[PDB]
Design a protein around this ligand. Structure first.
Ligand SMILES: Nc1nc2c(ncn2[C@@H]2O[C@H](COP(=O)(O)OP(=O)(O)NP(=O)(O)O)[C@@H](O)[C@H]2O)c(=O)[nH]1
Ligand SMILES: [Mg+2]
Lengths: 168, 63
């Protein structure tokens, strides 16, 4: 009864860390290998600020051959984590596409979203923070840098998205 | 092709096609489940069953 359910969706490219970020959040261990996820849904009960929250999370597939049914995954979720790798310029350029697909399927200029720059444990980043900052400023959403291996800002990213939903 | 399956706590997962335990091995460990403590399903089948047999039909899994 005093528990709220948040349906979260993680979208992005193929090799960014949609699964590593989610798996690090749930089981607190980073998957060094790479098994591309088709579709996965997880649930976790956490305490954000004051309330107890049940979080339904959807790990979509970045590959467009399986992202043909992307309208279905978007049509149900109430919040979206848009993930790019800071060593993948293409994944960052593809964020524009996803936001349009989200803003289309939900028919709104304001949707609870958070821009996440993943793989911030590496050096020689092809995408600077200031770039990803300006994009999030254009969308009106916050930007948080994460590292699934380091667990840096991984909690901050997800919890900020829930706050973005809860503060809608 | 592809076959979707349900998990506890209103969770689920889809995997492609072999041994049903070998096809769902990585995802079970990903989702947090040992294949000995659980088995497929409202009618249970064997773990060594061919995965490509139940293509198109969706199953459930509990401990
Ligand atoms: N150094 C580092 N490597 C990472 C990080 N996140 C993921 N990786 C690695 O980069 C790859 C990304 O894998 P994965 O987590 O499946 O990304 P994904 O976007 O979910 N793939 P898909 O959606 O197609 O299933 C893997 O080889 C993983 O080990 C991170 O924060 N740091
Ligand atoms: Mg994945």
């Amino acid at each position: 009864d005093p528990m709220t359910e948040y349906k979260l969706v993680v979208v992005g490219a193929v090799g960014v860390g949609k699964s590593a970020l989610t798996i690090q959040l749930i089981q607190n261990h980073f998957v060094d290998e790479y098994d591309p996820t088709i579709e996965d849904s997880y649930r976790k009960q956490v305490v954000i600020d004051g309330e107890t929250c049940l979080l339904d999370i959807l790990d979509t597939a970045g590959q467009e051959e399986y992202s043909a049914m992307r309208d279905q995954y978007m049509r149900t979720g109430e919040g979206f984590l848009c993930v790019f790798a800071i060593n993948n310029t293409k994944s960052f350029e593809d964020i524009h596409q996803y936001r349009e697909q989200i803003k289309r399927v939900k028919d709104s200029d304001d949707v609870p979203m958070v821009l996440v720059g993943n793989k911030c444990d590496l050096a020689a980043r092809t995408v600077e923070s200031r770039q990803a900052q300006d994009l999030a400023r254009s969308y009106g959403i916050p930007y948080i840098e994460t590292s699934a291996k380091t667990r840096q800002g991984v909690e901050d990213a997800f919890y900020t998205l829930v706050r973005e939903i809860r503060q809608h | 092709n592809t076959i979707r399956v349900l998990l506890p706590n209103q969770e689920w997962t889809v995997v492609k096609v072999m041994s049903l335990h070998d096809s769902l091995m990585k995802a079970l460990k990903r989702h947090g489940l040992q294949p000995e403590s659980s088995a497929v399903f409202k009618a249970r089948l064997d773990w060594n069953t061919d995965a490509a047999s139940l293509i198109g039909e969706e199953l459930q899994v509990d401990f």
